[PDB]
């Protein structure tokens, strides 16, 4: 789907080392934010596994102090926050995983920046 | 803070620069290659925080985001790096040029409108605060667009538009045996009478490697000098001279070369558990008794007056001892950001103190919890050189007055005179050794050697450049010019058996 194809493109879009890659990544992230911010009852559940893959996706792929990754990561975090603000406890299976990621996110190069 | 400098290099890819009438001399292509190497080394040393790019025109092939034929960007606008240096050096030499001609075209036609378009696009790609947009062309022919009148017309129209958009084009003379032929196609097209069979306009300085940090203009602190308690004036404090120090090293791993960060912890000994600053107690043992205090009292005992300047009075410049020096002086300029109108009063006081030859002594407080020292503000009148450029800024020289406990006592030394003929011998020796000194005559050879080694290892050279030390006296020349005088004065003073060394 649109969410899935955008996730795949962003998983690709970071293949090259250039600030333009980060620009297109954050643009796609902004579109995903404005898109999945308003699901009906169903697209949220697809976005759950999409966020799983894309969350851990950047967690293990970006993994670089390059700012081009930094703005994308911070926008991802903002979207995740505004999502979980009104999302329900259904995200709980991911949460501890996200927890196991989040501190690992922060304690890693995020600590250096 | 202000804008930065953007530099563009555009060499013609043709047959002219790969050939010369005297092959013993350097081909225009290759000499431009050492030129760009030298300027990139200087930029690395000085202002590596700016943008540099490489692009060629006239090549048979092409590569550019604008997709103009015969236009090939070699390097995008970027901070210089050793990878760029080696990428340029592999084409250096009378074999690197052949390589370049092998996997890279040259000699095809071009459009100056096209190169202006691509360079304008490249400059437009930069989203940072710029101040200078300098473009350097490398060709020795004003004809190639004079051949096509429409081409010359559009080229000069685009050049005028670019120069009106703040772009500065400067001309690099190239060795044309028939003559560079300026004033025919260039001064009417470039942003600004010998036809220049040669090439050297200022290429000598371009090839000249420069080792200087050249920190941009900045304010150390804008202190606010109080006259008595309320009539207070904003001033700017700078250091026109400031010790240049070696940049600190970078802790990195000896198996991956990446910089490894370090974290530092204060903790227990009996338990070893990590502790807090609240657990830390300042202690000082005098005699046998230990006094316990904390940091806050330590800086508060250094906090007496607010950051600023407190006038002590006025004193003629003669009442200061020449040997009375403590720390390098500062420069003080009027400031109208906090207090508006202070420039008028600064001019008035500068005029009055220059007329009265009296410096202003003040109590100086640099920042919070800082000791207020004594500072003498000598007038410093502006001086202009032959070209009327400021060689001495107008303002004040802020020197430091050492305290009584800032001076050390010496064993007493008696006075022993010398014969006036020995004084004449000294005067003759000095005259044989006299010259004129300038502040731009002597550098730090240690730092220069450290640099040369740094670039040599960065460039993986088999050998580093040797720094020329000007602080080594030429003993042979000095002895040649003195001759008799040395041992004449020796016999005048030192006994023949009593050499200076026992």
């Amino acid at each position: 789907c649109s969410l899935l194809r955008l996730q795949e493109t962003l998983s690709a879009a970071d293949r090259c080392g250039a600030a333009l890659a980060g620009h297109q990544l954050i643009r796609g992230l902004g579109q995903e934010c404005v898109l999945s911010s308003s699901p009906a009852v169903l697209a949220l559940q697809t976005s759950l596994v999409f966020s799983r893959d894309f969350g851990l996706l950047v967690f293990v792929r970006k993994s670089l102090n390059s700012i081009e990754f930094r703005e994308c990561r911070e926008e991802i975090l903002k979207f995740l926050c505004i999502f979980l603000e009104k999302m329900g406890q259904k995200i709980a299976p991911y949460s501890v995983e996200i927890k196991n990621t989040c501190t690992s996110v922060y304690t890693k190069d995020r600590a250096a920046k | 803070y202000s804008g930065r400098d953007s530099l563009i290099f555009l060499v013609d890819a043709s047959k002219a620069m790969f050939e010369s009438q005297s092959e013993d001399e350097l081909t225009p292509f290759d000499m431009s290659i050492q030129c760009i190497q030298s300027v990139y080394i200087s930029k690395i040393i000085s202002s590596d925080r700016d943008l540099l790019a490489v692009v060629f025109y006239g090549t048979e092939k092409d590569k550019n985001s604008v997709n103009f034929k015969n236009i090939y960007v070699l390097q995008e606008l970027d901070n210089p790096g050793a990878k760029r240096i080696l990428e340029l050096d592999q084409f250096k030499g009378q074999q690197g040029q052949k390589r370049f001609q092998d996997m890279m075209g040259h000699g095809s036609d071009y459009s100056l409108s096209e190169v202006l378009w691509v360079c304008a696009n490249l400059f437009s790609d930069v989203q940072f605060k710029m101040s200078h947009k300098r473009i350097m062309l490398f060709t020795n022919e004003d004809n190639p667009h004079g051949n096509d009148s429409a081409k010359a017309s559009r080229a000069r129209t685009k050049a005028g538009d670019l120069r009106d958009t703040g772009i500065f084009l400067d001309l690099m003379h190239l060795k044309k045996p028939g003559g560079f032929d300026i004033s025919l196609f260039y001064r009417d097209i470039i942003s600004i009478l010998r036809v220049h069979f040669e090439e050297s306009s200022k290429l000598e300085d371009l090839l000249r490697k420069v080792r200087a940090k050249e920190t941009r203009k900045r304010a150390l602190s804008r202190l606010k000098l109080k006259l008595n308690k309320d009539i207070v004036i904003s001033v700017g404090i700078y250091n026109l001279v400031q010790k240049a120090l070696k940049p600190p090293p970078i802790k990195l791993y000896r198996e991956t070369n990446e910089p490894v960060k370090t974290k530092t912890r204060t903790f227990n000994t009996s338990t070893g558990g990590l502790l807090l600053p609240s657990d830390t107690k300042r202690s000082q043992i005098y005699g046998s008794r230990q006094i316990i205090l904390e940091k806050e009292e330590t800086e508060e005992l250094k906090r007496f007056d607010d950051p600023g300047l407190m006038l002590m009075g006025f004193k003629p410049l003669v009442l200061l001892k020449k040997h009375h020096y403590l720390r390098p002086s500062l420069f003080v300029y009027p400031e109208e950001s906090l207090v508006i109108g202070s420039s008028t009063l600064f001019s008035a006081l500068l005029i009055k103190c220059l007329e009265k030859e009296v410096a202003a002594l003040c109590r100086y407080t640099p920042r919070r919890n800082i000791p207020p020292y004594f500072v003498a503000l000598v007038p410093q009148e502006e001086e202009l050189d032959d070209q009327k450029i400021q060689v001495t800024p107008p303002g004040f020289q802020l020197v430091f007055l050492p305290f009584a406990d800032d001076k050390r006592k010496m064993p007493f030394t008696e006075k022993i005179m010398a014969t006036p003929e020995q004084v004449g011998k000294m005067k003759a020796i000095v005259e044989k050794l006299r010259f004129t000194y300038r502040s731009d005559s002597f550098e730090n050879p240690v730092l220069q050697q450290h640099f040369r080694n740094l670039e040599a290892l960065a460039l993986d050279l088999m050998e580093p450049e040797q720094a020329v030390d000007l602080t080594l006296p030429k003993v042979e020349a000095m002895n040649k010019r003195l001759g008799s005088l040395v041992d004449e004065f020796k016999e005048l003073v030192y006994p023949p058996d009593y050499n200076p060394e026992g």
Binding site: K108 | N268, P402, M410, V486
Partner: protein, 82 residues
């Protein structure tokens, strides 16, 4: 205290010298020792530093495994003190 050395002029003149720092900035000769907040002992409160990797869950780089480098324009080159 004096500085026992020799001024030199060319390669044929030298005079022994004894230099003195007439003007010298003063500093406190007693540093602020740190002790415990309870036992008031420096012995119970000692110090260490840690060189752990910026990544890989802060894996500890061995103390001597660190080697200094230097900033070179847009690049950083490893460069030991030796």
């Amino acid at each position: 205290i004096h500085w026992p050395c020799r001024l030199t002029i060319g390669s044929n003149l030298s005079i022994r010298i004894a230099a003195y720092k007439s003007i010298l900035q003063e500093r406190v000769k007693k540093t602020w020792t740190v002790v415990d907040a309870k036992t008031l002992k420096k012995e119970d409160i000692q110090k260490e530093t840690v060189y752990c990797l910026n990544d890989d869950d802060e894996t500890e780089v061995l103390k001597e495994d660190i080697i200094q480098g230097f900033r070179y324009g847009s690049d950083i080159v490893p460069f030991s003190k030796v």
